[PDB]
Design an enzyme around this catalytic site. Structure first.
Site, mmCIF file in Angstrom:
data_model
loop_
_atom_site.group_PDB
_atom_site.id
_atom_site.type_symbol
_atom_site.label_atom_id
_atom_site.label_comp_id
_atom_site.label_asym_id
_atom_site.label_seq_id
_atom_site.Cartn_x
_atom_site.Cartn_y
_atom_site.Cartn_z
ATOM 1 N N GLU A 120 0.834 -1.179 0.000
ATOM 2 C CA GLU A 120 0.000 0.000 0.000
ATOM 3 C C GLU A 120 0.880 1.244 0.000
ATOM 4 O OE1 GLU A 120 -2.694 2.141 3.061
ATOM 5 O OE2 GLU A 120 -3.748 0.178 2.531
ATOM 6 N N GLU A 134 1.617 10.346 9.504
ATOM 7 C CA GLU A 134 1.406 9.282 8.523
ATOM 8 C C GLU A 134 1.870 9.720 7.135
ATOM 9 O OE1 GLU A 134 -0.785 9.724 11.008
ATOM 10 O OE2 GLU A 134 -1.015 7.700 11.836
#
Ligand SMILES: CNC(=O)[C@H]1C[C@H](OC(F)F)CN1C(=O)c1cnc2c[nH]nc2c1
Ligand SMILES: CNC(=O)[C@H]1C[C@H](OC(F)F)CN1C(=O)c1cnc2c[nH]nc2c1
Lengths: 369, 369
Positions: A120, A134
């Protein structure tokens, strides 16, 4: 002599996204030695998911998160991941997503000249403080990765534009979809489904913070109208009750017996309830990318989307935050079988359940095995 | 209320490169609080430099890199710089080049939500393991930086190719060039300079591993021919020699007192000696970037250059390592005042001595000051 492949599971949600990849690795025992390293603090469910997948971790580190600082997690993690990589000497490390653990795992691998496969890869907001940490973690992981497994063309394109080697960028789809082949049972029992009987279930998910205020009050007024117009419908909202909500709920929702606010569902329960849902109301990105592979129309409780692919494919529709459009779109899908089945049979653009196959084929080709 | 700008000095060679930037920040005491952090292991030369520039460190860290692993440097440096940043609360942290300290200085800033400006940004090899870890360090620092101070258009292009925001990328030139107005003093004496008269000085330096053996002998043979043909020329060669290599020099050159084999010069002496040179022969990347701003033609003891912009501008010319080529080109420039004066007056493309001014300007604009 086997390619030594170390998969890292740094957190409970990663369990579902990485377990199918490990299953896929374990189907090549002649060519591949699958090593599973778990670093999560909270393992009960992680072990639950591991059990269903037939996966036994080889390595277990306890990287403590609860009330720990970014610095503390960063240094301890880096030390412990370095130590396990010197101990196992894997030929490649597979890391998921945008966790701090993914970042430092990738640094530890780089400090041992061990290739990184980034599962991902390519999601960008280009705001380094939203989400924090993040966005930066996935950019940092990105410069250090040797192979990139993007769920979608959009994420693959973000990496191309960062001048990554196009030969190392793969559009694999979302490995969570892969999990559903395993987690969704032909037969399943849960209180929700016992109480549901032959009623059609509308399954609602909503983050509390971003729908705090008018939004949730609007969703409540809308679901109330849905059950008022459709006698054979039940609405189930799995949510952590806080007397804030409890009053909010009863005030609008009342006690007429077909709107159930229940405690959050664990991932396996969720999969198996969603698999038996007539309609989803959600603001979850994961639900938007996964639930459609279960044949479930999904309405998105947002005025804005960062998942345009699902909108265009016809697996998702923007419902907004306002009562009237939420009602109006759900009512339609409940009152017109054709409208429901159309959305239901639409191909999920985020994956076809073969992401893991594509990941492992790319690894084997990269290593000319 | 002042913008707090923290400048990191992480290694000895950074003293000359970041001191001019601190000097330029100290010219804005109403708008800017200049805060200096030194983390370099070796201090004698750095301290010498900071004192010449009138700079007093606010924070001194000892981060050991003598026989130390990347992991330990990474964790102990991250901790160290995090503590300093929590205390001093800078509005921006300025970091140089491709070092592990620059990387972790940036990560500590990020972990305090403090902006980073990257001095000398955009150098790319595109090979994650060559140099190791420097290439990865500059990519990691790259993703975390808020402002990018590129010495050359090519460095800025490299960053643009990675889809960095053009408004955050500035071609400033090379800050080392800005030092020269401070370090080079018309009232400066050196033994080697006393022995030189109105005689023309050829300063020769070769330290490259690949110029050991035959290339050294070719150089010395060409020097012999040059001082025999040009009677008003002295040659200065500041290198340390093995005894047997000394004997090779003596055998080829003789002892006729117009060729001075001396011990290596410290950065200040070198600046001032180079500044009084008529010609330079070098295999040093940095001398190629810096010495031309002193109006000295530079002949490069290599077959190919890693400084293409200097060639294009006519500040540099390849001499190869063959006796004939070195003799040929040095002789041309010592014979014809035109060809010398031409190269002497060509503009240095690596900077015009205002890189620090451009950096400060860019910082003030970005913070709306
Ligand atoms: C990345 N997002 C997720 O974790 C997705 C994956 C999965 O959806 C899938 F099945 F379609 C469950 N999920 C939720 O967002 C989610 C929301 N409300 C819940 C209440 N109880 N369990 C809950 C899970
Ligand atoms: C790689 N960069 C550097 O370190 C540059 C910077 C400076 O050049 C500038 F002034 F043009 C001195 N330098 C030398 O490489 C260098 C060579 N031979 C030397 C003999 N004695 N000191 C010496 C310094």
């Amino acid at each position: 002599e086997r390619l030594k492949v170390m998969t890292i599971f740094g957190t409970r949600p990663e369990a579902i996204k990485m377990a199918p990849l490990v299953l896929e690795l374990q189907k090549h025992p002649e060519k591949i030695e699958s090593i599973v390293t778990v670093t999560a603090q909270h393992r009960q469910m992680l072990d639950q998911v591991l059990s269903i997948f037939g996966i036994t971790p080889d390595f277990d580190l306890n990287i403590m998160k609860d009330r720990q600082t970014l610095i503390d997690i960063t240094t301890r993690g880096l030390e412990g991941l370095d130590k396990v990589m010197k101990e196992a000497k894997p030929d490649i490390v597979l890391v998921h997503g945008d966790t701090t653990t993914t970042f430092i795992a990738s640094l530890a691998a780089f400090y041992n000249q061990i290739p990184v496969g980034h599962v991902e890869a390519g999601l960008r907001t280009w705001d380094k403080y939203s989400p924090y940490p993040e966005e930066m973690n996935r950019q940092l992981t990105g410069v250090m990765a040797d192979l990139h497994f993007s769920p979608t063309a959009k994420s693959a394109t973000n990496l191309q534009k960062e001048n990554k080697d196009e030969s190392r960028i793969f559009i694999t789809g979302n490995t969570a979809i892969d999990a559903l082949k395993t987690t969704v049972k032909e037969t399943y029992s849960h209180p929700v489904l016992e109480k549901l009987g032959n009623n059609r279930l509308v399954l609602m998910t909503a983050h509390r913070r971003e729908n705090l205020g008018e939004p949730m009050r609007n969703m409540f007024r809308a679901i109330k109208r849905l059950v008022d117009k459709h006698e054979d419908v039940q609405v189930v909202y799995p949510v952590h009750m806080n007397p804030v909500v409890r009053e909010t709920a009863n005030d609008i929702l009342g006690d007429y017996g077909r709107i159930h606010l229940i405690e959050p569902l664990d991932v396996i329960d969720f999969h198996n309830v969603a698999a038996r849902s007539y309609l989803m109301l959600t603001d979850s990105g994961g639900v938007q990318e996964e639930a459609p592979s279960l044949g479930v129309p999904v309405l998105v409780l947002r005025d804005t989307t960062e998942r345009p692919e699902g909108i265009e494919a016809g697996t998702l529709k923007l419902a907004g935050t306002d009562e009237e459009t939420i009602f109006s779109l759900a009512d339609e899908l409940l009152s017109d079988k054709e409208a429901h089945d159309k959305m239901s049979k639409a191909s999920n653009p985020y994956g076809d359940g073969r992401a893991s196959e594509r990941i492992v084929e790319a690894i084997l080709k990269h290593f000319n095995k």
